[PDB]
Design a protein around this ligand. Structure first.
Ligand SMILES: [Ca+2]
Ligand SMILES: [Mg+2]
Ligand SMILES: [Mg+2]
Length: 430
DNA sequence: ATTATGACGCT
DNA sequence: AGCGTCATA
């Protein structure tokens, strides 16, 4: 009753760019705008691999991971933009730089946590309190929420999409009690107003559209964001959780999309997130461990406490390349040449990072994959990163992996290498 | 023969 | 430390 926490203490948003790499390319090349199009890397093997897809192209069934030649079978008029290649490898600089554009705008509104190249969590709790003070018991107009969906509404006693959206929003606003500044539902609504403003700022100042979720924690904000894409935002209230979770596959919740999620389904014999409520905390801890068990017990009730971390910059800077099938590296010279290529890109990015962000990396991590190994990484070794110099870094990387070479012949490398990875870690202020 | 990333947990 | 899991475009 009165002592039962409800996880309604914070307002958290998740902002995620729509078909991000595609929008970056469409901004640059107006011929690609409002067309079925995709971004691809490499070209020789089956037309290149697709890594991002416009919503127009998704209507034909085009997806990420598809070979472009195969995508063309579904969508013959598909337009393509290629990722830049430098030093023999895909170079993602343009997209990293576009990401910084967006993150810097978001940072004007609130503390953000960079969750990937195109998404960030926002802790709006303080901003909401401030806005509520300005408002002074003043009602919130639907006009302030022109692209917001309220999950679960409309309900109870129009056949068009926008019509339904407004009906739900009207029901929601009709109900609100703007008289109480501590009302969680009111707080979420003010959060959503701010996020409309944030999203408008992003589009005005970059040209990029995005979707967003607004809820009381990161997991629900992430889930909410995906409910209405593209170019829309969704508010998931605490009260919406039981119905939302009653038919929500477990795998849709962040962190449950893999083996742990599969085990929750198998061991408990359930399919939907809501079904978890019937287990005690101790039962869940017994199967999934102390940490996971407590997390699941709260999460299935819509409660999660993971904080929005104050971190706008990536914690590592890495460079990696696969060498699949027949392209695997089989000579020492090959291995050294490609380590150099990677190290040169890494040096370039590190030097820029040091100038922009007043920090220096202190550890170099070297990782490789050997032909036959099912695992993505076969081996990982670290050494000191004491100078931003590509020849030194490549020489040092070779030193830490050279003993992996089975070949009795110094000149030959066996088993051939199917991946190389250099990563700078452990930053210190500079 | 998806590839190129990046955060965090376990022991 | 080195390995594994889960996630991004
Ligand atoms: Ca996105
Ligand atoms: Mg994303
Ligand atoms: Mg995606």
């Amino acid at each position: 009753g009165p002592h039962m926490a409800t996880g309604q203490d914070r307002v958290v948003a998740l902002v995620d760019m729509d078909c991000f790499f595609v929008q970056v390319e469409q901004r640059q090349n107006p011929h690609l705008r409002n067309k079925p199009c995709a971004v691809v890397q490499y070209k020789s093997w089956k037309g290149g691999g697709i890594i991002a897809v416009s919503y127009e192209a998704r209507a034909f069934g085009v997806t990420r991971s598809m070979w472009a030649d195969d995508a063309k079978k579904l969508c013959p008029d598909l337009l393509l933009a290629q990722v830049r290649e430098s030093r023999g490898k895909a170079n993602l600089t343009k997209y990293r730089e576009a990401s910084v554009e967006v993150m810097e705008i978001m940072s004007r509104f609130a503390v953000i946590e960079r969750a990937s190249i195109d998404e960030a969590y926002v802790d709006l709790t303080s901003a909401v309190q401030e806005r509520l003070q300005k408002l002074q018991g003043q009602p919130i107009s639907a006009d302030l929420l022109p692209s917001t969906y309220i999950e679960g509404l409309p309900q109870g006693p129009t056949v068009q999409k926008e019509g339904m959206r407004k009906q739900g929003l009207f029901q929601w606003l009709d109900s609100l009690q703007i008289d109480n500044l501590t009302s969680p539902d009111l707080q979420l609504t003010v959060g959503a107003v701010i996020v409309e403003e944030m999203r408008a700022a992003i589009e005005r100042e970059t040209g990029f559209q995005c979707s967003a979720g607004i809820s009381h924690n990161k997991v629900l904000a992430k889930l909410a964001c995906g409910l209405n894409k593209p170019n829309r935002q969704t508010l998931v209230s605490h009260g919406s959780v039981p119905q939302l979770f009653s038919q929500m596959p477990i795998r849709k919740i962040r962190s449950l999309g893999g083996k742990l999620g599969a085990s929750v389904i198998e061991i408990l014999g359930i399919e939907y997130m809501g079904e978890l409520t019937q287990f005690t905390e101790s039962q869940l801890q017994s199967h999934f461990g102390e940490k996971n068990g407590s997390w699941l017990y709260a999460m299935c009730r819509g409660i999660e406490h993971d904080p929005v971390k104050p971190r706008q910059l990536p914690k590592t800077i890495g460079c990696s390349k696969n060498f699949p099938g027949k392209t695997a590296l089989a000579t020492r010279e090959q291995v050294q040449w490609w380590l150099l290529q990677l190290a040169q890109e890494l040096e370039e990015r590190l030097t820029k990072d040091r100038n922009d962000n007043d920090r220096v990396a202190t550890q170099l991590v070297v990782s490789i994959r050997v032909q036959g190994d099912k695992r993505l990484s076969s081996l990982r070794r670290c050494c000191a990163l004491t100078r931003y110099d590509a020849h030194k870094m490549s020489h040092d990387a070779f030193t830490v992996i050279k003993n992996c070479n089975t070949s009795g012949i110094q000149t030959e490398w066996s088993p051939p290498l199917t991946m190389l990875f250099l990563c700078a870690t452990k930053f210190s202020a500079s």
